[PDB]
Amino acid sequence: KMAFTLADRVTEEMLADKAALVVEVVEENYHDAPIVGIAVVNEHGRFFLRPETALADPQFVAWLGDETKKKSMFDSKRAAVALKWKGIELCGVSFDLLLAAYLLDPAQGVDDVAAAAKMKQYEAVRPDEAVYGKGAKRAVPDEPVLAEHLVRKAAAIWELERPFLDELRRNEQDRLLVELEQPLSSILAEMEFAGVKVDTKRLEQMGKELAEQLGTVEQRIYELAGQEFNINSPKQLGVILFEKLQLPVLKKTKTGYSTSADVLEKLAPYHEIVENILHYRQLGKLQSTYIEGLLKVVRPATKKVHTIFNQALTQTGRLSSTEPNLQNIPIRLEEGRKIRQAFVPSESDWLIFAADYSQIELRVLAHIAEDDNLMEAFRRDLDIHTKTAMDIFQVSEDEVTPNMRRQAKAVNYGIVYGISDYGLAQNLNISRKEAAEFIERYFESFPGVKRYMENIVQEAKQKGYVTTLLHRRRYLPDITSRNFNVRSFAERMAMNTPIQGSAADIIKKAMIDLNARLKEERLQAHLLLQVHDELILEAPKEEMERLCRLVPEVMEQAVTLRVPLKVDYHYGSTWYDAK
DNA sequence: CATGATGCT
DNA sequence: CGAGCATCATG
Ligand SMILES: Cc1cn([C@H]2C[C@H](O)[C@@H](COP(=O)(O)OP(=O)(O)OP(=O)(O)O)O2)c(=O)[nH]c1=O
Ligand SMILES: OC[C@H]1O[C@@](CO)(O[C@H]2O[C@H](CO)[C@@H](O)[C@H](O)[C@H]2O)[C@@H](O)[C@@H]1O
Numbered sequence: 093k094m095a096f097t098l099a100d101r102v103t104e105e106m107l108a109d110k111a112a113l114v115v116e117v118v119e120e121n122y123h124d125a126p127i128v129g130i131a132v133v134n135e136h137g138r139f140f141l142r143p144e145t146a147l148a149d150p151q152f153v154a155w156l157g158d159e160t161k162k163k164s165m166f167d168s169k170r171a172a173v174a175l176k177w178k179g180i181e182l183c184g185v186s187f188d189l190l191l192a193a194y195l196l197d198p199a200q201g202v203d204d205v206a207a208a209a210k211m212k213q214y215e216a217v218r219p220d221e222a223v224y225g226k227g228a229k230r231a232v233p234d235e236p237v238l239a240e241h242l243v244r245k246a247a248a249i250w251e252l253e254r255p256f257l258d259e260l261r262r263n264e265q266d267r268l269l270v271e272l273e274q275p276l277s278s279i280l281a282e283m284e285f286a287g288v289k290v291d292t293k294r295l296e297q298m299g300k301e302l303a304e305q306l307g308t309v310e311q312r313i314y315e316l317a318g319q320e321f322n323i324n325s326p327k328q329l330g331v332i333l334f335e336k337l338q339l340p341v342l343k344k345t346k347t348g349y350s351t352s353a354d355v356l357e358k359l360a361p362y363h364e365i366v367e368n369i370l371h372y373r374q375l376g377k378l379q380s381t382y383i384e385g386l387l388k389v390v391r392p393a394t395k396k397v398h399t400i401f402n403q404a405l406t407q408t409g410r411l412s413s414t415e416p417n418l419q420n421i422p423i424r425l426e427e428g429r430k431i432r433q434a435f436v437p438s439e440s441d442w443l444i445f446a447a448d449y450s451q452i453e454l455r456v457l458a459h460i461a462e463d464d465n466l467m468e469a470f471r472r473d474l475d476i477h478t479k480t481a482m483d484i485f486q487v488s489e490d491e492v493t494p495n496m497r498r499q500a501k502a503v504n505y506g507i508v509y510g511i512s513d514y515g516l517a518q519n520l521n522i523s524r525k526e527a528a529e530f531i532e533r534y535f536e537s538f539p540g541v542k543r544y545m546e547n548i549v550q551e552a553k554q555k556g557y558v559t560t561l562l563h564r565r566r567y568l569p570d571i572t573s574r575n576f577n578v579r580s581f582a583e584r585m586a587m588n589t590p591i592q593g594s595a596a597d598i599i600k601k602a603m604i605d606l607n608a609r610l611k612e613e614r615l616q617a618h619l620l621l622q623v624h625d626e627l628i629l630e631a632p633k634e635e636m637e638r639l640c641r642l643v644p645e646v647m648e649q650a651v652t653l654r655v656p657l658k659v660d661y662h663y664g665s666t667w668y669d670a671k
Numbered sequence: 672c673a674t675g676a677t678g679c680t
Numbered sequence: 681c682g683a684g685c686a687t688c689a690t691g
Contacts, residue, residue, distance in 0.1 A: 324689055326675065347674065347691085377677040380688055408684060410680085417686045420679035428678080453680085453683090509682035519682080580681085588683045592680090596684095624680040624684085 094216070096131075096138035096243040098236070102146055107155040108134035112249035113163040114242045115143075115171035115182070118224055118232055121415050122170045123284070123398040124177045128232050131242035133250045140239035153180055162186040164249045166205045168274075169403070172281040189249050191273045192256040194404035195265045199567060202404070205245045212255045217244040264563040272562060272597070273403065275604050280401045280411075283619050287396030288418065289438040290386055291666075298431065299383040302375060309372045316365040323372055326351060337363055354518050374425060382422065382431050389416050396438070401622070408589050409564045409596040410624060419623045421667075432668035437630045445617065445636065446670040447643045447661035448626040451476060452595045453508050456561075459653040460590055463540025470655040477501040483537040484530045503530050507541065508591055510584030545587050552586040560593035561651065562601070598657070599625060602650040609646055613638070628667065636663055 099106070111134035119125035130141040146152045155161050156175065164187035165171060172182045193202035193211060202208045206219040223241045224230050232238060260266045314320045317336065322328040330349035333339050339362050343350035353370065360366045390397050399418045401411045413419040421435070422428025437444055449455075454476055458466040469479050481492045481500035492500075502519050503511075511519075513528035520527065535542040549571065552558050557567040566589045570582035603622065610617055617631030617639055627647070631639055644659035651657070662670045 322690080324676080326690080328690095345675065350675085352676075373677065377688075381678070381686090385687075406684060410684060412685055414686065417679085420677090420686065422678065424679085506682055509684090511682040514681035516682085577681090584683070592683060595680090626680080 094138065094240070094244060094247060096140055096239070098140045098239050100142075100145065102141065102149040102152045104151075105136040106132050106134070106139050106141075107151060107161065108136060109160065110134060110162050111164070112246040112253075113165055113171075114246045114249075115165075115175060116238075116242050116245075117170055117174040118230070121400060122174045123400070125174055127174055127178065129238050129242045131239070131246040133243065133246040138243050138247060140243055147175075147178060147180060157181040157183050159183040164189070164253050166190045166208065166245065166249055167404075169277045169281045169284075172278065173285050176281065176285045185274065185277075186270075187249075187253045187257070188269075188274055188277060189252060189256065190404050191277065192260060192269055195268055195273065195564065196256070196259060196263070197565075197567060198404075198407045198409075205248050208256075209248045209252060212252055214248055214252060217248040263565060265565070268563050268597075272600055272604065276600050277403060279603055279607050279619065280403065283621070284398055284400060286438070286618060286620065287391070287394070287398040288620050289395050289436050290390050290397055291434045291436050292387060292390055292392075292395055294434045295383055295387055295431075298434070299379065299387070302379045302383060306372065306375050306379060309368060309375060313365060313368050313372060316363070316368060323369060324376065329369070333359070333363075333365070337365065339363060339366075357521060374428070378422065378428050378431065382428070385416050386434070399621075406596075407566055407585075408593040409560060409600075410592065411596075411622060413621075418621050430668060433666045435667035436665070439630075439632075441633055442630050443633050443636060443663045443665060444620075444667050444670045445629045445631055445639050445643065445661065445663040446626060446667065447629075447647060447659050449595075449599065449647065450658040450660055452598065452625045452657070453591050454504060455653065455655050455657060456591050456594050456598075457508055457541065457544075458655050460594065461538075461540045461544035462654065463538045463544070466538050466541065467655050473656075473658065477504060480504050480534065480537070484533045486533075499530070503534055507531075507534060508588060510587050548586050548590065549583050552582070558586050558590050560590050560597050562594070562597035564593050564597060566593070595625060598651050599627070599647075602647045603627065605650055606643065606646045609642055613642070615639075628670070639663070 111132050114131040115127055116129045117125050118128055127143040130143055130146050132139045162184050165185055166189040168185040168188045175182045189208050193208040200207065204220040206217050209217050218241060223233060257266060260269055313323060317332045321332055326348055329351055334341050334349050339359050341349055342355050342358055356366050356370055386397060397416060399413045400415055401413055403411055405412050422431055455470055458470050469476050477497050477500050478489065478492050480503060481496040482489060484500055484503060485496050499520055506516055513524055513531055516530060517524040517527035548558060552568045552571045557565045559565050568582045568585055570578045571586060573579040615631065615635055617629050617635050619627060619629050621628040640661065644661050647659040648657045664670045
């Protein structure tokens with residue numbers, strides 16, 4: 093039983109200076125999506141409004157946009173962006189229950205009010221799936237059922253704010269919410285709604301050229317196999333490789349024969365079909381994901397793509413990007429990297445500006461490990477891969493080969509992920525004995541890294557969780573498991589999550605500090621994309637010289653560690669050219 | 672919906 | 681038997 097007014101006009105008592113507010117968008121992708129209902133709960137009552145009415149009401153719209161009128165919400169960014177598509181500004185969000193729940197425990201996967209409510213045993217609200225249905229059954233119910241659901245969501249947010257802020261304070265996460273995550277949500281909403289302009293003619297032309305070149309490679313594969321088959325089917329490719337061609341079976345997957353990139357590398361000495369298959373797959377990814385996917389989702393009249401940054405998903409505090417994912421555009425191979433030529437500035441006489449932290453996770457490892465050898469390399473800006481090579485191969489600087497540096501780089505990032513000697517041997521295609529020596533030599537060279545790995549596992553066992561620089565937490569109950577595989581994966585999380593997560597906290601703080609400085613100076617430059625350790629902007633060409641100073645300095649100053657942060661930056665006419 | 676491939680940080 | 685992700689075609 094919950095009393096509410098199904099209102100047919102806006103009243104002053106709905107425009108209080110503290111309220112919980114629901115602006116319901118049912119479509120998972122909320123860009124230009126319908127708003128299906130509005131609810132407001134405040135000290136005066138509980139109200140459902142039809143959006144045709146509220147959003148055409150001058151005083152409701154002014155209330156939405158008034159910073160001083162404070163709103164508690166769940167997934168404020170989804171409402172902010174859906175309102176921006178309706179030309180309505182939402183301001184004054186002072187509590188976001190989605191981000192509060194995420195900070196309390198990202199492993200709960202909270203993605204609706206009822207899941208956040210479960211954290212406090214609050215039962216007076218149903219799950220969105222119970223009301224809307226799943227999958228093909230998804231639908232807005234009849235008004236009275238809809239209005240009840242949205243009012244119970246707003247009433248849950250109203251009641252839950254205090255309990256969640258108190259727990260956040262106990263976990264030292266109250267500033268993490270209010271000074272970091274909530275202001276970042278507003279920034280992301282602006283980046284998503286601005287979108288990134290795409291040169292669809294270039295994409296369509298690359299799609300033409302790739303369709304030709306896939307057909308060439310496909311045919312050569314069939315020639316070498318002496319049979320036509322589905323190169324993307326594991327069953328069919330495994331029959332050709334391992335039964336027709338009689339190659340050795342190096343690894344199995346749960347359902348058959350592995351054809352992983354590392355397996356295929358090991359098979360390449362046996363048959364020329366193996367290099368061709370690796371090539372086809374690379375081309376197939378460019379066509380199926382990047383070319384065909386971007387062209388599907390670009391808005392044709394503006395040529396913009398509008399991704400969604402999920403702020404409340406990863407276990408370490410990173411963002412993720414979806415529909416489309418703009419954080420995995422190709423770079424490594426030149427064929428794919430040219431996709432970046434299609435990412436252009438949204439106005440004439442504008443340029444793309446890309447700035448990236450240089451080796452942030454290795455700098456963070458040096459800070460948190462307090463390892464004297466490591467921190468000195470960064471404090472003196474010495475090439476850390478060369479430094480590691482000189483240690484794992486034991487040679488002077490001049491004796492380090494191109495190949496030695498490659499191996500030492502693999503060791504340096506491997507350590508950050510908890511690599512075993514087995515993994516290092518597979519990655520490098522070298523003797524496991526040798527791999528083990530490399531790791532042993534690393535820990536002898538960087539003994540504070542070894543101490544940190546022992547100490548953080550112990551801390552996880554004693555406290556039940558590990559933390560990052562700005563006090564994000566990840567719980568690791570498997571750290572005590574009797575199963576070797578389960579325990580070992582938890583220990584690698586304990587080692588890695590403070591690294592990866594503290595790097596995520598640093599670039600999020602940079603984004604907030606950068607947006608402040610751009611606004612201070614009244615620059616037209618603004619953020620387009622974040623790619624984990626990089627920020628991509630666009631700006632009038634005339635703003636370039638200012639951004640060359642301002643962007644790296646804000647990024648580098650975002651926090652102060654036991655080593656410097658270092659930012660590299662590039663600009664040009666397309667994202668490809670910003671190298 | 673699951674699988675195992677690809678892409679990025 | 682190296683951390684965190686999204687996407688695709690196929691099963
Ligand atoms: C190899 C590797 C790179 N990266 C990321 C970090 C960098 O932002 C990005 C590009 O890596 P690189 O530029 O290849 O690495 P680096 O900056 O250490 O190398 P170099 O000294 O040779 O210039 O990829 C990972 O996150 N994990 C990895 O295992
Ligand atoms: O709105 C982003 C925000 O919503 C959640 C659900 O609370 O995720 C939904 O929307 C995403 C963006 O389209 C989808 O990818 C996802 O499938 C859907 O559940 C939160 O996870 C997210 O932070």
